[PDB]
UniProtKB/Swiss-Prot annotation:
Entry GO CC: cytoplasm; nucleus; protein phosphatase type 2A complex
Protein function: PPIases accelerate the folding of proteins. It catalyzes the cis-trans isomerization of proline imidic peptide bonds in oligopeptides. Acts as a regulatory subunit for TAP42-associated PP2A-like phosphatases modulating their activity or substrate specificity, probably by inducing a conformational change in the catalytic subunit, a direct target of the PPIase. Can reactivate inactive phosphatase PP2A-phosphatase methylesterase complexes (PP2Ai) in presence of ATP and Mg(2+) by dissociating the inactive form from the complex. Acts also inhibitory at high concentrations.
UniProt KW keywords: Cytoplasm, Isomerase, Rotamase
Disulfide cross-links: none
Additional remark text: Present with 2430 molecules/cell in log phase SD medium.
Catalysed reactions, as listed in the record: [protein]-peptidylproline (omega=180) = [protein]-peptidylproline (omega=0)
EC number annotated for this UniProt entry: 5.2.1.8
Interval of the full protein contained in this chain: 3 to 299 of 358
UniProt-recorded name of the protein: Serine/threonine-protein phosphatase 2A activator 2
GO BP field: mitotic spindle organization; response to osmotic stress; TOR signaling
Subcellular location: Cytoplasm
Length: 292
């Protein structure tokens, strides 16, 4: 028994709520944990839960390679993919997290299932990346993750790995952008990369938001800074066409004096344009670890 429940000023009962406050806080703790760290500055002895989390991602990674495009917009084999995760997620989690009761698995599995896109629409958006985080927040809130010893590693090992998988799905199956931000959404599929990415560069004595226009910087830090990775990805797609053509929020953001002001904007923006969009939020699952 856990599901979604939202409409018109159910949403007013959303910002006010202590869940929003708890969860919002969590994602910030994660953003700042990572506040001056390149993609591979992990915090020391990589805590054992983090490994298990990574080797559950590899299992998912594996499951995509069992499903080849054998047959425009949206490639149906993805539903074959989704169907696999949908029917193993309980089995998968139990294997990597033997601590977890029958009943907690019930609460987690659903999020794992919806982390990767829609079976019916063959698409992905902010809501899906958000589900993942909800999962990750659930693990944490069941004692599977220690905020101090993990935090940084949740972002650098777990989320970046996740993003790597999305990038394979996205390319392999031609997942449609969930496109439920107007025209001033950052990117076809993703938000949090930019968010975290910006925490990463707050501290940099040399990259400036204007930098994402400089192609040599972009490929030099592609695999080293989330935010540049994304830009590098974008640059494939909109070959030798300017960035505005592709995404004028991004274009506008690059005009901001510092990474530091950018990151703050990015939080106001997430608070406002993800966690208060009826369209997104009414597809977000409440659960015992996320009440309402």
């Amino acid at each position: 028994p856990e599901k979604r429940l939202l409409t018109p000023d159910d949403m007013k009962l959303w910002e006010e709520s202590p869940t929003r406050a708890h969860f919002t806080k969590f994602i910030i703790d994660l953003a700042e944990s990572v506040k001056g760290h390149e993609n591979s500055q992990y915090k020391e002895p990589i805590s054992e839960s983090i490994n298990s989390m990574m080797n559950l991602l590899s299992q998912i990674k594996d499951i995509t390679q069992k499903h080849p495009v054998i047959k425009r917009f949206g490639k149906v084999e993805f539903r074959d993919f989704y169907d696999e995760v949908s029917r193993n997620s309980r089995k998968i989690l139990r294997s990597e997290f033997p601590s977890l009761t029958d009943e907690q698995l019930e609460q987690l599995s659903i999020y794992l299932d919806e982390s990767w896109g829609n079976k019916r629409r063959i698409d992905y958006g902010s809501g899906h990346e958000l589900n993942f985080m909800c999962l990750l927040y659930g693990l944490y809130s069941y004692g599977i993750f220690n905020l101090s010893n993990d935090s940084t590693n949740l972002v650098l090992k777990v989320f970046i790995e996740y993003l790597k998988i999305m990038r394979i799905l996205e390319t392999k199956y031609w997942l449609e952008p969930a496109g439920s931000h107007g025209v001033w959404g950052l990117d076809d599929y993703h938000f949090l990369p930019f968010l975290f990415g910006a925490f990463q560069l707050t501290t940099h004595k040399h990259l400036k938001p204007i930098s994402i226009h400089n192609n040599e910087l972009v490929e030099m830090f592609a695999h080293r800074y989330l935010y540049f990775g994304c830009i590098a990805f974008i640059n494939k797609v909109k070959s030798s066409a300017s960035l505005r053509w592709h995404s004028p929020m991004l274009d506008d953001i690059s005009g901001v004096k510092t990474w530091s002001k950018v990151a703050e904007g990015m939080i106001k923006m997430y608070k406002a344009e993800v966690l208060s969009k009826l369209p997104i939020m009414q597809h977000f699952y409440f659960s015992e670890f996320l009440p309402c």
